[PDB]
Design an enzyme around this catalytic site. Structure first.
Site, PDB file in Angstrom:
ATOM      1  N   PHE A  42       2.964   6.761  -0.301  1.00 32.35           N
ATOM      2  CA  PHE A  42       1.888   6.457  -1.440  1.00 32.35           C
ATOM      3  C   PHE A  42       1.860   7.680  -2.257  1.00 32.35           C
ATOM      4  O   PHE A  42       2.011   7.666  -3.527  1.00 32.35           O
ATOM      5  CB  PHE A  42       0.799   5.790  -0.684  1.00 32.35           C
ATOM      6  CG  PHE A  42      -0.293   5.563  -2.136  1.00 32.35           C
ATOM      7  CD1 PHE A  42       0.140   4.919  -3.344  1.00 32.35           C
ATOM      8  CD2 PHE A  42      -1.450   6.212  -1.878  1.00 32.35           C
ATOM      9  CE1 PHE A  42      -0.736   4.545  -4.128  1.00 32.35           C
ATOM     10  CE2 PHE A  42      -2.524   5.726  -2.954  1.00 32.35           C
ATOM     11  CZ  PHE A  42      -2.155   5.058  -4.030  1.00 32.35           C
ATOM     12  N   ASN A  87      -8.698   9.855 -11.067  1.00 27.37           N
ATOM     13  CA  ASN A  87     -10.143   9.662 -11.366  1.00 27.37           C
ATOM     14  C   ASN A  87     -10.569   8.777 -10.526  1.00 27.37           C
ATOM     15  O   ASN A  87     -10.220   8.410  -9.354  1.00 27.37           O
ATOM     16  CB  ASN A  87     -10.143   9.095 -12.667  1.00 27.37           C
ATOM     17  CG  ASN A  87      -9.471   7.793 -13.173  1.00 27.37           C
ATOM     18  OD1 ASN A  87      -8.788   7.111 -12.151  1.00 27.37           O
ATOM     19  ND2 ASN A  87      -9.521   7.316 -14.187  1.00 27.37           N
ATOM     20  N   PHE A 141      -2.235  14.575  -8.542  1.00 29.47           N
ATOM     21  CA  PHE A 141      -1.917  13.339  -7.791  1.00 29.47           C
ATOM     22  C   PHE A 141      -0.387  13.245  -8.187  1.00 29.47           C
ATOM     23  O   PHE A 141       0.116  12.762  -9.092  1.00 29.47           O
ATOM     24  CB  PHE A 141      -2.624  12.083  -8.563  1.00 29.47           C
ATOM     25  CG  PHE A 141      -2.170  10.916  -8.125  1.00 29.47           C
ATOM     26  CD1 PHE A 141      -2.021  10.354  -6.712  1.00 29.47           C
ATOM     27  CD2 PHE A 141      -1.817   9.878  -9.038  1.00 29.47           C
ATOM     28  CE1 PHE A 141      -1.583   9.286  -6.418  1.00 29.47           C
ATOM     29  CE2 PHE A 141      -1.114   8.661  -8.878  1.00 29.47           C
ATOM     30  CZ  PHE A 141      -1.166   8.184  -7.542  1.00 29.47           C
ATOM     31  N   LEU A 171      -1.249   1.263 -10.270  1.00 26.15           N
ATOM     32  CA  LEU A 171      -2.064   2.315 -10.902  1.00 26.15           C
ATOM     33  C   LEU A 171      -1.806   2.336 -12.423  1.00 26.15           C
ATOM     34  O   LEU A 171      -2.413   3.565 -13.073  1.00 26.15           O
ATOM     35  CB  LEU A 171      -1.822   3.863 -10.117  1.00 26.15           C
ATOM     36  CG  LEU A 171      -2.230   3.690  -8.750  1.00 26.15           C
ATOM     37  CD1 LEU A 171      -0.972   3.772  -7.795  1.00 26.15           C
ATOM     38  CD2 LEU A 171      -2.966   5.087  -8.353  1.00 26.15           C
TER      39      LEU A 171
END
Lengths: 54, 48, 174, 143, 144, 157, 339, 44, 96
Positions: free
Chosen positions: F51, F93, F104, F113
């Site tokens: 992930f 965020n 990220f 996302l």
């Protein structure tokens, strides 16, 4: 992209290394990923068995 | 910065004095209201 | 050190920023107060005026005359003084010896031309020697000068950065 | 580093024993003679024979351009430098006079602003005292 | 595989394998150099700890050793009859998770845990087993 | 044009390209925080296998943020960029526009996302470092048992 | 390559110390003197020997105050308590005895060592004594209850020395398996292992004012810095089995060598300012030359050594010595010093 | 340099005095408006 | 102007109170620590806090670089040329 091929002003192919991972595989974390072929392993086992028979 | 520090100290003292005066006026108003309530209660007791 | 000791109840980081109309009204009030009473040329906060050229302890009379000549020029930036006789250092041409010229006058003119040519040759030899010394030591001299200039510029930049950092810290604390 | 008196490299750099300011020896001696043995920029007295310590180091080699290799070229460069120095001194004097005039005008404006601020503060204090001591009288109707 | 500050394959994960982070392990040639000669080494503080730290460590170590003395004294001479009728309960707030298939949120529980009343006459219930010694802590590099 | 930022980790080197013409404000925020030494010495606080590798916290907790526009700034989702594979640099965020100083790196195609986080870069050189980052033992809360401390991250040039 | 420091301040210049000379030799023991303990008021000292007696001697006169029996094997440890009127002996008979000095009688036994006990240290602030022996274990005992509150295991050889200090590492055990172990006393766990010595570590000492210690095996003394055990320096040139080590309040390291040798070192620099060889009591063999135990008195002005010719030797530093009569012969050499 | 430092200090003092005069004028105007509104209303 | 030990331009120059030699502050501190408060080139002791005076540079005047176009540099060059010409003239007169 780690090694860079440059044709310099003298017309010769130079290969500069950004890191030091090519010369010695320190800083190269894929030193674990080297796999010796069958012939080299057979040579090592044969030499160890030759020492045993000696 | 030195002038602002001196002016901040002076303005804080002046604001504290003004707040003390306002609190004294509020306390005087509360005392006057209490005295008026006591006088009204005394007048109601005297009339009854 | 500044001599300003007046205290005004101003809080730029706390109080709201005044509007342009409020700033104009404040400027008008300040102008009215300035027109109310005359200005004092002998104020204690104001420093003493600059002394004259003749009254200066460091300025010489020749320097005072040069300053007066520069001030009399309409353009002080473009006020260039008269250059010296640089034509005498050039190559002396052959003088036109007239047929009616006397032998003594022609000899004197030839002697003057020979003296000018000898001075020009001496200047050329000195220039050749200086050029030889330049070709000998120019890389070292230029490297030393560039290193000194870079060091001075780095020191000036470091001083300016330290002053800016101190000003920023004082502004943040205030 | 540079001399405090002229801003250039001093031929004989000497530093004050109390202030630590390096300057040319002749310039420091002239400043002490003109200011009665007082250091420039300070109110302390500087001894020219005791408070001045010379600095011993290698000589600074100035970069010689190839154009100024002749005596007439050097004389022309010296004349141009003298004219530039005179013009810079005149411009500095004019800028100092203009700055003094601007400082006098700013001082007059600051005095006017101080007087106006005092008057406005007095008026605001009077208004605040009137509002704070504003006792609420009996609001009788107009009979 | 990690890398160090200058950038090489870090081999101190092999010497430190099986040990905690507070364990001091010498595993490089840099440990064989004197501290004064050890490159990035200027001022070395060679002073004893002050009375505050000394007394704090004394308090901590003597509390631990006092607990050990209490345990050893309990083991050395038992108190004839080993019962305690001051069985004060302990209350536990237990929030169950999801298990055995179903995922419905069960209600959280308040659990009273009380020590069980033991027969004062009961002898020790189980025999003592002689189990051989476990392997030692992973030995350090040999810094000859 | 893409501008480069160099993460000097305790796993290898990661050279990231940054997309100025697609999400600018995040890119000079990243450049200013990297060149100032702010990302020098923080941790890669969260690693989830297949992930995420997420880091950038000054406190190493999940709450720190020191963006150059104050304390936070707004989102800059451009639909040309979508999370589409391994190694994509995005600004993370918490709900609405709360962009601080947390970056990220997507480790796998995560197409859920999109529109929630600001894609503003890409791993250019050194994807094996990120692959070895993903394959670390993490204990319970996606924080690795070992430390994946960042040391340097520079504009190179 | 690991970088070195080229500042030439990594080598401290040695301070001058006067040489030491023989003062006294006390006979009467019928075994090798292996224990020595000066009481905290510097009046008497305690020698334990191979004749399983403990003798109490007046320090000023060297005059035999008392003899105490009760051990049956060689006395290896001895400690006069600075906070209690107690003396603490250990022996090769597995016995750890606590003597009440108000009655001159053994009042406590600390039993549990499976073999002979070699060392015994009193914790400077806590009420704890620490023994080590041939069973590879450092026993940590509570004084009051005689309870073995810690079993420090991990050595694979005889625990030959041991120091107690007031800060972590609170126990330091040197062993004959060539390792040194730094122990946190509160948990009973090894904080660190030092494996720099090649042979059995027989001597340890701590500095009185610095937070450093020293270990010693044959041919090698190593100085280390607490609490991380970082290698500070080497004391080099004593090519013998080193049984003992004595640093002074004036920074003196004393190494006594089993062949009868002696080295006096400056602590900070590592410079050997004296190199002696002891002499045997008449009747002894050449093989009986050996310093088996040593200590300083509380003043630091006398070195007490118990020697394998059954003797007690007192050593004073020379009062008629100056830095000109005995100059320091140390120079800052520029050698790689292959480590 | 002394004149420039004095001029900068005078400019900063003039800006601070202008801000203080604006704040005092705003406060006085607010106080006058409040007094006028209190006189007009009467009921508190 | 350069450091006596470092040999480069010092950003924080310091001068000895006994010798007047300009050097770097860190270099002077290291030399005093190494040689036990001994100044370089001198057998006399130098105090790090007392015998070392820092050098402060004032930027009140405009900076003049040390080039050949400077008035003092031109004056020094003219003086050197005049001295060389005088020496050459004296040698030529003696030879004549």
């Amino acid at each position: 992209g780690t090694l860079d091929i440059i044709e310099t002003e003298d017309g010769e192919m130079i290969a500069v290394d950004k890191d030091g991972t090519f010369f010695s595989t320190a800083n190269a974390t894929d030193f674990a990923q080297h796999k010796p072929d069958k012939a080299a392993v057979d040579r090592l086992v044969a030499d160890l068995r030759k020492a045993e028979e000696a | 910065r030195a002038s602002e520090e001196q002016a901040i100290q002076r303005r804080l003292e002046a604001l504290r004095a003004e707040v003390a005066f306002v609190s004294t006026r509020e306390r005087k108003a509360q005392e006057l209201y209490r005295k008026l309530r006591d006088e009204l209660e005394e007048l109601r007791l005297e009339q009854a | 050190m500044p001599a300003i000791t007046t205290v005004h109840e101003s809080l730029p980081y706390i109080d709201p920023e005044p509007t342009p109309e409020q700033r104009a009204a404040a400027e008008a009030l300040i102008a009215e107060e300035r027109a109310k009473v005359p200005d004092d040329p002998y104020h204690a906060l104001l420093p003493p005026p600059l002394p004259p050229l003749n009254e200066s302890r460091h300025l010489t009379p020749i320097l005072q005359n040069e300053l007066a000549r520069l001030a009399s020029s309409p353009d002080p930036q473009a006020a260039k003084m008269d250059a010296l006789d640089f034509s005498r250092y050039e190559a002396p041409e052959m003088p036109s010896i007239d047929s009616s010229q006397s032998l003594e006058e022609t000899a004197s003119q030839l002697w003057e031309t020979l003296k000018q040519a000898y001075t020009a040759q001496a200047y050329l030899s000195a220039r050749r020697a200086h050029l030889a010394l330049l070709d000998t030591h120019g890389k070292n001299a230029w490297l030393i000068g560039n290193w000194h200039l870079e060091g001075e510029v780095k020191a000036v930049e470091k001083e300016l950065a330290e002053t800016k950092r101190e000003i920023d810290r004082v502004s943040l604390a205030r | 580093m540079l001399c405090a008196l002229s801003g250039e490299i001093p031929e004989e750099p000497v530093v004050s024993k109390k202030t630590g300011v390096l300057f040319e020896k002749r310039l420091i001696l002239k400043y002490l003679e003109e200011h009665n043995n007082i250091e420039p920029g300070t109110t302390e007295e500087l001894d020219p024979e005791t408070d001045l310590l010379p600095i011993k180091t290698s000589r600074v080699v100035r970069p010689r351009p190839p154009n100024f290799t002749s005596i007439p070229s050097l004389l022309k460069a010296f004349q141009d430098e003298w004219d530039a120095l005179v013009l810079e001194t005149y411009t500095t004097r004019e800028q100092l006079a203009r700055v003094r005039e601007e400082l006098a005008t700013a001082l007059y404006q600051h005095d006017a602003a101080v007087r106006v601020i005092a008057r406005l503060t007095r008026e605001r204090d009077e208004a605040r005292e009137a509002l704070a001591r504003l006792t609420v009288t009996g609001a009788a109707p107009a009979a | 595989v990690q890398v160090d500050s200058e950038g090489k394959v870090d081999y101190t994960a092999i010497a430190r394998q099986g040990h905690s982070s507070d364990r001091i392990i010498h595993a490089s040639f840099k440990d064989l150099i004197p501290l004064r000669q050890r490159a990035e080494a200027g001022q070395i503080d060679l002073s004893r700890p002050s009375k505050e730290e000394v007394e704090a460590t004394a308090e901590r170590t003597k509390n631990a050793l006092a607990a050990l003395v209490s345990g050893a004294l309990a083991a050395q001479k038992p108190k004839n009859v080993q019962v305690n009728t001051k069985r004060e309960a302990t209350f536990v707030k237990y929030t169950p998770s999801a298990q055995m298939g179903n995922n419905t949120k069960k209600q959280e529980r308040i659990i009273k845990i009380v020590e069980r009343q033991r027969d004062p006459m009961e002898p020790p219930k189980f025999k003592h087993k002689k189990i051989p010694r476990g392997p030692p802590s992973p030995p350090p590099p040999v810094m000859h | 044009m893409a501008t480069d930022v160099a993460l000097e980790t305790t796993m290898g080197t990661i050279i990231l390209e940054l997309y100025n013409q697609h999400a600018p404000r995040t890119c000079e925020n990243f450049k200013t925080l990297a060149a100032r030494g702010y990302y020098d010495g923080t941790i890669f606080h969260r690693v989830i296998k297949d992930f995420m590798v997420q880091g950038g916290d000054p406190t190493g907790t999940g709450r720190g943020g020191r963006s150059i526009y104050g304390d936070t700034f707004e989102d800059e989702i451009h639909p040309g960029l979508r999370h589409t594979g391994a190694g994509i640099l995005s600004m993370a965020n918490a709900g609405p526009n709360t962009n601080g100083s947390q970056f990220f790196l997507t480790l796998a195609p995560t197409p859920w996302l999109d529109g929630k986080h600001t894609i503003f870069g890409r791993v250019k050189k050194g994807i094996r470092v990120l692959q070895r980052m993903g394959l670390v033992p993490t204990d319970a809360d996606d924080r690795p048992k070992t430390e994946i401390k960042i040391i340097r991250a520079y504009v190179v040039g | 390559l690991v970088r070195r420091s080229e500042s030439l301040l990594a080598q401290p210049r040695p301070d001058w110390h006067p040489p030491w000379k023989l003062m006294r030799v006390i006979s009467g023991h019928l075994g090798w003197v292996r224990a020595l303990a000066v009481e905290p008021n510097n009046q008497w000292f305690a020698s334990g020997a191979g004749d399983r007696t403990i003798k109490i001697w007046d320090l000023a006169s060297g005059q035999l105050r008392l003899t105490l029996t009760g051990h049956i094997s060689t006395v290896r440890g001895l400690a006069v308590s600075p906070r209690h009127p107690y003396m603490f002996s250990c022996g090769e008979d597995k016995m750890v005895k606590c003597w009440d000095l108000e009655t001159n009688k053994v009042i406590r036994h600390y039993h549990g060592h499976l073999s002979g006990v070699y060392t015994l240290k009193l914790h400077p602030t806590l009420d704890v004594l620490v023994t080590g022996g041939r069973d590879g274990v450092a026993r940590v005992w509570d004084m009051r209850t005689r309870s073995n509150v810690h079993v420090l295991s991990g050595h694979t050889g005889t625990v030959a020395d041991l120091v107690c200090q007031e800060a972590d590492p609170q126990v330091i055990t040197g062993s004959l398996d060539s390792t040194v172990r730094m122990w946190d006393l509160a948990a009973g766990k090894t904080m660190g292992v030092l494996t720099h010595h090649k042979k059995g570590v027989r001597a340890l000492v701590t500095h009185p004012t610095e937070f450093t210690f020293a270990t010693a095996s044959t041919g090698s003394i190593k100085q280390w810095k607490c609490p991380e055990g970082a290698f500070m320096q080497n004391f080099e040139g004593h090519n013998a089995i080193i049984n003992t080590l004595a640093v002074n309040d004036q920074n003196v390291l004393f190494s006594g060598g089993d062949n009868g040798s002696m080295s006096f070192w400056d602590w900070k620099s590592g410079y050997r300012f004296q190199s002696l060889d002891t002499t045997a009591q008449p009747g002894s063999l050449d093989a009986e030359l050996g310093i088996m135990s040593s200590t300083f008195d509380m003043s630091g002005a006398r070195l007490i050594t118990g020697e394998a010719d059954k003797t007690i030797k007192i050593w004073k530093e020379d009062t008629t010595a100056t830095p000109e009569t005995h100059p320091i012969e140390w120079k800052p050499s520029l050698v790689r010093r292959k480590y």
